[PDB]
Symmetry: C3
Subunit: 130 residues, 3 copies
């Protein structure tokens, strides 16, 4: 039992709080998963951030109970000569029998960065047992 | 059933088109997979690129039908002081019942870059159902 | 369909010329009753950084009781980075349990004397299957 959602682009976003990346959503309930474990992979292979103060993006895996895992990339220069593509992957294993109905990908600005996904990205899950 | 192929190095390559990374090939047919879903992970943990115009590498997951997912890393300087190692992971979920016999890893130059893998890299797949 | 996972929210700062264990990134394959088959292992360190004076970086490894099965690194592209940016890292290996594997662990080693930092979420995961 394999869940997968993929996008080829997202709207540009700037946010001080975690907001949902449109299209990176897995309905666990719709697949009739009510117990057990999901290994979740948020894969954003070609993201970039724009800004004037060491830009970056915070990414999270979230369920109906909140954020379960988060991370980020940041550039190593204040004003990068060019905002290079910086691959990002996040892996978390969640318990469904806690009352999980959904899994989603979120993002949040680092230091006011504008966040960009303009190519393929994916949210995936494999089901198993404790 | 768990598919896996790993390499410890590849030849240096420059290409304006996607070409196959030698050794990163999964034979779905030989494994007797003709239906269902594969979650594929292309993992190139220690790549780098060389060039004079903001180097990088494009990576793709491809089947007998073509590319199903792609991404890249790029540096953030035109002529990096040193071409740092830039980890890359791509994840895609494919339908084997569409006529898939193989899954392979490909790469393509960014702006004429020379592409380097000189350490471990892997192409993996887990089979499941919808 | 057993799913193994270990996660941390931080580790101690480390400088090491040799691979050392990242505390908390450990999977007991035996205790889970796995004695045969294949594990697909993912080491995920999404927000690491390194500090140093000479193009800093970190080497990461997946290891078993038999030794290292896979390794990689990130490195910065400047000798003395203006700031040590967070550089996401993932390593994927598929191992055989029936060779005498009891455990899987995450390791790290300095690049050029770097100090190694994990101060946020990181994970070691495994999915069991067969050839
Ligand atoms: C923000 C810039 O984005 C550039 N990339 C593009 O503008 C671009 C244009 C067309 C296609 C793609 C692309 C294609 C396949 C997969 C991902 C991206 C990138 C990239 O090369 C630079 O280093 C920099 O990060
Ligand atoms: C291109 C350069 O490559 C260097 N890497 C090596 O020269 C090197 C030499 C021996 C072994 C390895 C290695 C070992 C394990 C896994 C990956 C690479 C790297 C690296 O330190 C620099 O920052 C830079 O990106
Ligand atoms: C070493 C620096 O680390 C900074 N990050 C932090 O200091 C920081 C502070 C509080 C929280 C977090 C964090 C939160 C969620 C996930 C990961 C990290 C980072 C980062 O923005 C910079 O670019 C740089 O790499």
């Amino acid at each position: 039992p394999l869940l997968s959602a993929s996008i080829v682009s997202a709207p540009v976003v700037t946010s001080e709080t975690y907001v949902d990346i449109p299209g990176l959503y897995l309905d666990v309930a719709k697949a009739g998963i009510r117990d057990g474990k999901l290994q979740v992979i948020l894969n954003v292979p070609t993201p970039y951030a724009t800004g004037n103060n060491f830009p970056g993006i915070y990414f999270a895996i979230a369920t109906n109970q909140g954020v379960v895992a988060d991370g980020c990339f940041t550039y190593s220069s204040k004003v990068p000569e060019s905002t290079g593509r910086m691959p990002f992957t996040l892996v978390a294993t969640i318990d469904v029998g806690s009352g999980v109905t959904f899994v989603k990908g979120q993002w949040k600005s680092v230091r006011g960065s504008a966040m960009h996904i303009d190519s393929y990205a994916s949210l995936s899950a494999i089901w198993g047992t404790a």
